[model samples]
Target: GKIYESAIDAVADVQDGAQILFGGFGICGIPEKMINALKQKGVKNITGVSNNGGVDDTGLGVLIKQKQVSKVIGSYVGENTELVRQYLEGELAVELTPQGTLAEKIRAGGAGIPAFYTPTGYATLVQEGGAPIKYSKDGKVEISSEKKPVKEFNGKNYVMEESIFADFAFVKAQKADPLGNLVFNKAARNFNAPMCRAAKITVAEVEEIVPIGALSPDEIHVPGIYINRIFKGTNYNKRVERLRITEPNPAQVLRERIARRVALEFHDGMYANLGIGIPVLSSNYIPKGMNVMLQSENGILGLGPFPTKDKVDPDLINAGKESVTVVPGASYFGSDDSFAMIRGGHVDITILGAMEVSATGDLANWMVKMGGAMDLVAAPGTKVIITMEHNARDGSPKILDTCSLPLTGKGVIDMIISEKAVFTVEKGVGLTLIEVAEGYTVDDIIASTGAKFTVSPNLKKMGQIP
Candidate 1:
């Protein structure tokens, strides 16, 4: 990860109409500096790529406002009025990629993989007469009748996805040493890392810069090899989508109660990142002064329990983009800079909330279609623990034999902590039921789930309420 003197200077050499990859999910981890620089440089007819278009006044939204962006290639068009206005006014062009596939494309580019294929957005307005659909089986073409199931997706089975290359990648970061080793703070780590490597020139702007040896080698998330330039960025205005003071529903109440019960399970000095949905609520239940760090993908660490009415910072948000606050002595860098911390693996356990978990521990939060969550899982090799209700409200198990939904992390979930039980996923073993809720039996859980898994011999009912 690296930084530059200013956006204007940074984009000075960038030509107009260049295809650039700007990192950020919503308004979270976008390279605000480069965007501002592009605006100052008056670059026009530019094709920008990212997970989502930025919010109204922030992120990539600035480019949209300045009429600097000609076309946007993203999965989600943001809630920004300008983007909506420009699109409707025919001032901008757009190409919507499936959220999951878009993430993989950038990742593949970074890893030097030329291309890959996926089934998402195979046939729909999402495809809209773009790439042609091809049929193949065992690497041989096979013909099958096309059919549609009422009230569901129409048409074919799979479509081809192409590779992407960008002229410049503008990414955000939390901290960088002179050598360009980066670290993210929390939720902000989302799209910044992969976008860094997917471009011809990658630029990172950090909040702080430490000496090379100041950071431990093991703590680094992205090595210096990929990043070309680094700069210290300024003034990040973090925003939250919504806020709730009390439990929103029975599920929220249940998760909070269980988290309080499970708090003691954590030993001293363990660091953790909270996921969206139910697991994000667990931060309010942690005991004070436990020496544990609470991280969110939006890039705040050393989270001070939950925010009080008198102490809330509208800028401190979790991965879901909900407002929160930091404790005294807690530090914050720019949103992108903060993400550099998480992407770098300074945190230990990543506790995320998920909609479903596969028998193989694949996670499918991105499949929910509610928002772009693919950015969060892009960070490298972080220990991930998911929290969810063992069963859905409709009486279906959330853990399935295999995830038919778009996956957030493929076979990457390390554990699941839910109201019904706690399970750990190991490399060889599938989902190993480790604990059951007070009233349920292992048979009850096994019967409820579609998974093929074994009951851990040490499986026991959860310990008593404190």
Candidate 2:
């Protein structure tokens, strides 16, 4: 019985310094009107809990630009520069949570669970914060989050993350019934469902408001009881955080080649998760007539190829936040369930981009920083694939004897594919050169490789790189 007249009225009771949970993967599914209303309300010192701080001038970026946000808790920040600038300037406090872990935090909060153990951020910055949070103008540390507690279960380490109970949750829905039953649009459903139940008050802004029961029972993603208020939003603009509008390049050709080789790793009906960067290209290269289920940490299974520009749907996106389509029988769930699939051994393979892959199967992907959560979940027998450029831009070999960068996972990789060669991990022996790119020799491999490994006796020349 709580419908609001406008976004302003819905957010009227929110106070300064309130903790606000925002529902969106990036810019998609954000409560733009409520954000605008909050900006108009001019609240200050608010704590923001979100996945990604929207790119500058949109979503949370607007409030962040006004200096109203005092702290942010989320996974990735590559999309927002102001958050980084403010953190560096000591104007804001930032806590970096792993993407899957962050989603579970909100889900756990709403489920009446106080905290949960996850392997997602074990031994990374997500578990331990050593980076200087705020430095003095002269380069001295004023604040830092360090030494987070960890526990071991079943011979594996897990980090405990507490639930995020927010003062208010702001979410966007495609449609809502009068009683507030919500039906989200495609991937935009994302964290919105979890956030609805995680807050003291959940106010949803919808594109369309229908009479109760207008939505089919099976179609509602969030039950009405979880929402405190709902209103039809105005001036809805489905904005793209970043647009990919160009043709392929040499780098892309290299990535596609790597992906094509990575595709051979798939077995029939295998559940696979492809990490961002070159690994995403593997989706487009899956062998024809073979059935493979693609999974995303954003809670999508049966992920499909990138949609054509003319057929793009704003809500249809992958875990990487890029526009994509869904294959028939694709199922969508919340992030918690997706990572559960990853951690539970349901996923058979994972292919990710890497900065360095040691001969011993250690992988360093996202950054060179130490102890940051790798955010890749793998179970025993899960085949791991790492794809990369043949060498770093500086001509240093990325396939090293031991990674100079921090490890995302140890002894997790089963194979490494690059523009130059294909390496298979042999349990006791280490990285073995199974195949090399056309026209490259064992001597050439030795010159380019940082790690020491024996060439396979039956070394085969790889198909030509396009």
Considering every candidate listed, which one attains the maximal TM-score?
A: 2
Clashing pairs in 2: 124-371, 124-372, 124-373, 125-371, 125-372
- For model 2, residues 319-356, the per-residue Cα lDDT tens digits are 66777778999998766676566666788887777778
Global local distance difference test of model 1: 0.66
lDDT agreement with native, every candidate: 0.66, 0.79
Worst 10 residues of 1 by lDDT: 132-141
Candidate 2 off by > 4 Å = 136-139, 244-249, 368-373, 377-381, 426-429, 463-466
Angstrom error of the Cα, residue 189, model 1: value is: 12
Q: Report the number of the highest-lDDT candidate.
A: 2
How many backbone clashes does every candidate have?
31, 5
| Per-residue lDDT of model 1, residues 1-466, tens digit only | 4446656666677888888888776776668777777777787888988767777767888888888887787777757778867665556666666555666678777778877644444333333343212223232223222332222224423445566778888888788888888887655666776777788888888888889797789987778877888888768765545663433276566777567545645557877766565555565555555677776544456665445656544445655656566656566443334445554556666766677788777777543123334433434456777777678767788888777765655556777777777788984348888888788887788777778778889888765333
